[PDB]
Design a protein around this ligand. Structure first.
Ligand code: HEM
Ligand SMILES: CC(C)c1nc(CN(C)C(=O)N[C@H](C(=O)NCCCCNC(=O)OCc2cncs2)C(C)C)cs1
Ligand SMILES: CC(C)c1nc(CN(C)C(=O)N[C@H](C(=O)NCCCCNC(=O)OCc2cncs2)C(C)C)cs1
Length: 455
């Protein structure tokens, strides 16, 4: 397989037998991708074991992959390891199985439903605020990821079966304790390295029932969803709309819910911590934002759907943080069949990969790409921004279905958090921040910050 890119005249790093290029992942996905763009230009190919991956950076070609020929060629992603029943999770499903689940779960994130969560997730804003105060008179650096973690868990749980939890103040609630494994899902463990060199071993793991998703969790939710289906509401949000529309197996319902529990927890939490790092290392941006909030919501007023979209600088700050720290790092699609996009021929079976992280830090689009500058995203400057270079939620029919929910939910956290506190660096604060060793962006060391109340 290692002769494909030579034969197609596409440049790239020299593959070793069996391994392909995987040894290059030792400097991390981010450095590997940056270095490849730098020295190969617009397009290159590499091997994840025997799997050919073709990197693209042309905004049109990108638009052809993600938008135009999605349904007909570039419809699916590549799974990593034994996935078991999670074969039917929206995120992992393929072709018609996927299209059905997407159409089915479309209506979850309508602006109507979005409006209906504001008041629910408000309740957990207050809980967050309280937890943040008690942690601040500690006078000792605060692990935000922990505090934010608790918040975003609580929010999405309620967005399914209003199963209310204090998280922090309930480390034992069956729903909290048991879902603890579903992240830390170790995206960094060598098993994913091995399984890429030995993808031929996956069907052996499937047959033995070994699954990358902990058995403990799958088992909790199958019975949880059983109960909240019958027991909890047999008299007369996401979960409901799953049952209400019943061909959707209960096993496939758990599939979606696990995707949602994970995504709703890690994304929100990790992004909010990158954002507060950036506000703490830029006090002026922090105050400027604190002023916008106080102007739009006078006297610590409660945020509403309409006021949240009203906050331009807030949007600017969130957008810019996601430019520097797009947690997905790469976008990927499997080429279903032979094609010629924008001139170049892609053969069946290649994974076409868009290196988001590199693109978000590419000099040809970004002045001082390394610096946190929200001005970049002001209404008179955002014209200069290509929606196929900046893509923190992907693009096209298979983009982040949770985009508007995430944004919304992150802002509601910020607005409540900045209404009451200010955030400042200290000793245990890592400056400059160092990124996760691998494929899902996380901080190297947990983000720790000083928190002062505003009276
Ligand atoms: C700010 C945090 C988040 C970021 C940066 C983010 C980013 C992404 C990106 C880049 C993709 C890939 C799309 C593509 O390939 O073009 C994606 C897929 C997806 N995301 Fe989001 N996401 C976030 C939060 C969420 C939330 C809150 C949910 C839902 C509760 C969610 C559910 C999904 C699902 C289900 C997919 C697979 C989509 C499909 O195959 O139909 N993510 N996420
Ligand atoms: C539920 C959560 C813990 C997840 N675990 C995984 C890991 N597993 C088991 C996979 O097979 N993942 C596969 C995977 O990691 N793809 C290869 C790298 C893709 C790089 N881009 C990338 O990560 O895009 C973000 C997303 C894509 N889909 C959902 S989020 C895909 C099916 C997402 C994906 S989402
Ligand atoms: C783990 C590390 C040792 C290595 N993995 C590899 C294999 N490669 C190239 C991979 O792409 N690996 C995979 C990978 O890093 N995938 C990227 C993360 C995908 C998981 N989820 C994810 O992307 O979440 C963001 C979301 C947005 N909306 C909902 S979730 C696997 C670790 C799942 C080489 S070295």
């Amino acid at each position: 397989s290692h002769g494909l890119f030579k034969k197609l005249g596409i440049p790239g790093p020299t593959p070793l037998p069996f391994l392909g290029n995987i040894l290059s992942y030792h400097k991390g996905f981010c450095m590997f991708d940056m270095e490849c763009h730098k020295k190969y230009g617009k397009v290159w190919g590499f091997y994840d074991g025997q799997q050919p991956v073709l990197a693209i950076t042309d905004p049109d070609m990108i638009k052809t992959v993600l938008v135009k020929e999605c349904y007909s060629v570039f419809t699916n992603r590549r799974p990593f390891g034994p996935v078991g029943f999670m074969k039917s999770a929206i995120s992992i499903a393929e072709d018609e199985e996927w299209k059905r689940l997407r159409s089915l779960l479309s209506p979850t994130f309508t602006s109507g439903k979005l409006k209906e969560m504001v008041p629910i997730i408000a309740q957990y804003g207050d809980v967050l605020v309280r937890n943040l105060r008690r942690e601040a008179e500690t006078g000792k650096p605060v692990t935000l990821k922990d505090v934010f973690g608790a918040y975003s868990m609580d929010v999405i749980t309620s967005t399914s079966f209003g199963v209310n939890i204090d998280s922090l103040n309930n480390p034992q609630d069956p729903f909290v304790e048991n879902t603890k494994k579903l992240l830390r899902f170790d995206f960094l463990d060598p098993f994913f390295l091995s399984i890429t060199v030995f993808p031929f071993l996956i069907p052996i793991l499937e047959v033995l029932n070994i699954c990358v998703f902990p058995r403990e969790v799958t088992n909790f939710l199958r019975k949880s969803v059983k109960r909240m289906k019958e027991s909890r509401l047999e008299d007369t949000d996401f979960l409901q709309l799953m049952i209400d529309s019943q061909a959707l197996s209960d096993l496939e319902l758990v599939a979606q819910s696990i995707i949602f529990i994970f995504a709703g927890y890690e994304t929100t939490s990790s992004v909010l911590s990158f954002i507060m790092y950036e506000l703490a290392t830029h006090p002026d941006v922090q105050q400027k934002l604190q002023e916008e909030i106080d102007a739009v919501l006078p006297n610590k007023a409660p945020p509403t759907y309409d006021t949240v979209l009203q906050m331009e600088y807030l949007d600017m700050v969130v957008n810019e943080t996601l430019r520097l720290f797009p947690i997905a790092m790469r976008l990927e699609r499997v080429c279903k069949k032979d094609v010629e996009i924008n001139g170049m021929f892609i053969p069946k079976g290649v994974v076409v990969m868009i290196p988001s992280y590199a693109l978000h830090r590419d000099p040809k689009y970004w002045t001082e790409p390394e610096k946190f500058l929200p001005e970049r995203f002001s209404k008179k400057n955002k014209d200069n921004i290509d929606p196929y270079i900046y893509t923190p939620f992907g693009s096209g029919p298979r983009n982040c279905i949770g985009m508007r929910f995430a944004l919304m939910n992150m802002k509601l956290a910020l607005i409540r958090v900045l209404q009451n506190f200010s955030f400042k660096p200290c000793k245990e604060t890592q400056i400059p921040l160092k990124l996760s060793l691998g494929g899902l962006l996380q901080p190297e060391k947990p983000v720790v910050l000083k928190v002062e109340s505003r009276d």
